[PDB]
């Protein structure tokens, strides 16, 4: 006798699958993400975004700003030594 | 007005730069500099969840964080050879310690009533010496008041003074003739070694502040 009609309705393998939850997530997350960004280091732009670019990028952990800032404090109280002299 | 005011401003500006000029506009990838301030976050998360863990630890996590960073930065700044007494103005550090101690004592009294004085009953011990163990528990409890400040103060102050006195001696070795300037460098190398030790122990002392005033807060929040 005639083969039954349950297989001709699908709406329980289309909404009844687990990656649907991931699908609706990653259509929003990925589709709505700019493939590229603006600029990594730019804070303090006044030729001191350049200071950030040379020293406070994630492209270096080089000791130069530390040295520079340290030397600043040496310059601060030392000048004041000759101001207090 | 004062010199002291100028270096307090400098501390504020250093701290601003670590959450401004160290990240690349907050990449999730992370920046080399910003990894440092991640690790600090993690070790105070895991330290103060370890100390003052309970049903809360995050409610006192900012307080312990600004106590970390202040001492952490100020024992590098105070160790620049032309930088003025902030922490080495002992009255500010000891005052900060006493303020926190009073702010624990008041917090304990307020939150835990007059059974706050059950904090100064320490254990179920034989009853004829239970009151004695209250007397010399309170004595040690307000020894916690001055100890916390005096640890940091002594370490930082002694380091700077030690270096300066020995510097003055090597000055006078090299102020007399060159045969004394030979083997005038051998003590100088000792001052360099002492400076290495003094930078190390200031970061160690910084951990000790924030663990001790987590330990005291553990006691204060969780009675006995």
Swiss-Prot record, chain A:
Q: Which GO terms describe its cellular component?
A: mitochondrial inner membrane; mitochondrion; proton-transporting ATP synthase complex
Q: Which organism is it from?
A: Saccharomyces cerevisiae (strain ATCC 204508 / S288c) (Baker's yeast)
The encoding gene is ATP17
The name on file for this protein is: ATP synthase subunit f, mitochondrial
Report the family membership: Belongs to the ATPase F chain family.
* UniProt-listed GO biological process terms: proton motive force-driven ATP synthesis; proton transmembrane transport
Listed A to Z, the keywords are: ATP synthesis, CF(0), Hydrogen ion transport, Ion transport, Membrane, Mitochondrion, Mitochondrion inner membrane, Transit peptide, Transport
Q: Where in the cell is it found?
A: Mitochondrion; Mitochondrion inner membrane
Q: Does the keyword Cell membrane apply?
A: no
General remark: Present with 14600 molecules/cell in log phase SD medium.
What job does the chain carry out? Answer: Mitochondrial membrane ATP synthase (F(1)F(0) ATP synthase or Complex V) produces ATP from ADP in the presence of a proton gradient across the membrane which is generated by electron transport complexes of the respiratory chain. F-type ATPases consist of two structural domains, F(1) - containing the extramembraneous catalytic core and F(0) - containing the membrane proton channel, linked together by a central stalk and a peripheral stalk. During catalysis, ATP synthesis in the catalytic domain of F(1) is coupled via a rotary mechanism of the central stalk subunits to proton translocation.
Describe its partners and assembly state: F-type ATPases have 2 components, CF(1) - the catalytic core - and CF(0) - the membrane proton channel. In yeast, the dimeric form of ATP synthase consists of 17 polypeptides: alpha, beta, gamma, delta, epsilon, 4 (B), 5 (OSCP), 6 (A), 8, 9 (C), d, E (Tim11), f, g, h, i/j and k.
The reply to whether DNA-binding figures as a keyword in the UniProt entry is: no
Superkingdom of origin: Eukaryota
From Swiss-Prot, chain B:
What does the subunit section of this Swiss-Prot or TrEMBL entry state? Answer: F-type ATPases have 2 components, CF(1) - the catalytic core - and CF(0) - the membrane proton channel. In yeast, the dimeric form of ATP synthase consists of 17 polypeptides: alpha, beta, gamma, delta, epsilon, 4 (B), 5 (OSCP), 6 (A), 8, 9 (C), d, E (Tim11), f, g, h, i/j and k.
State the protein's name: ATP synthase subunit a
Q: Topology relative to the membrane, per the entry?
A: Multi-pass membrane protein
Regarding protein family, the annotation reads: Belongs to the ATPase A chain family.
| Gene from which this protein is expressed | ATP6
Q: Please indicate if the UniProt record lists Lipid metabolism as a keyword.
A: no
Keyword Transmembrane carried by entry: yes
**PROSITE patterns (alphabetical):** ATPASE_A
Instruction: List the top taxonomic levels of the source.
Output: Eukaryota, Fungi, Dikarya, Ascomycota, Saccharomycotina
């Amino acid at each position: 006798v005639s083969t039954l009609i349950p297989p001709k309705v699908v709406s329980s393998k289309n909404i009844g699958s687990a990656p649907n939850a991931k699908r609706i997530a990653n259509v929003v997350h990925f589709y709505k993400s700019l493939p590229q960004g603006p600029a990594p280091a730019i804070k303090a732009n006044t030729r001191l975004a350049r200071y950030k670019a040379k020293y406070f990028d994630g492209d270096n952990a080089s000791g130069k700003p530390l040295w520079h800032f340290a030397l600043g404090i040496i310059a601060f109280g030392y000048s004041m030594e000759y101001y207090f002299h | 007005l004062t010199t002291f005011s100028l270096y307090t401003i400098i501390v504020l500006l250093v701290i601003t730069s670590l959450y401004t000029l160290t990240n690349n506009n907050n990449k999730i990838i992370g920046s080399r500099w910003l990894i440092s301030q991640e690790a600090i976050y993690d070790t105070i998360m895991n330290m103060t969840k370890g100390q003052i863990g309970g049903k809360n630890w995050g409610l006192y996590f900012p307080m312990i964080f600004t106590l970390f960073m202040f001492i952490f930065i100020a024992n590098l700044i105070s160790m620049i050879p032309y930088s003025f007494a902030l922490s080495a103005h002992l009255v500010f550090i000891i005052s900060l310690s006493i303020v926190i101690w009073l702010g624990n004592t008041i917090l304990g009294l307020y939150k835990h009533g007059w059974v706050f004085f059950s904090l100064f009953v320490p254990a179920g011990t034989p009853l004829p010496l239970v009151p004695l163990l209250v007397i010399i528990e309170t004595l040690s409890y307000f020894a916690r008041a001055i100890s916390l400040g005096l640890r940091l103060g002594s370490n930082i102050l002694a380091g700077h003074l030690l270096m300066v006195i020995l510097a003055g001696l090597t000055f006078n070795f090299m102020l007399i003739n060159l045969f004394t300037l030979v083997f005038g460098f051998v003590p100088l190398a000792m001052i360099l070694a002492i400076m290495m030790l003094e930078f190390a122990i200031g970061i160690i002392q910084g951990y000790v502040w924030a663990i001790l005033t987590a330990s005291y807060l553990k006691d204060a929040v969780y009675l006995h």
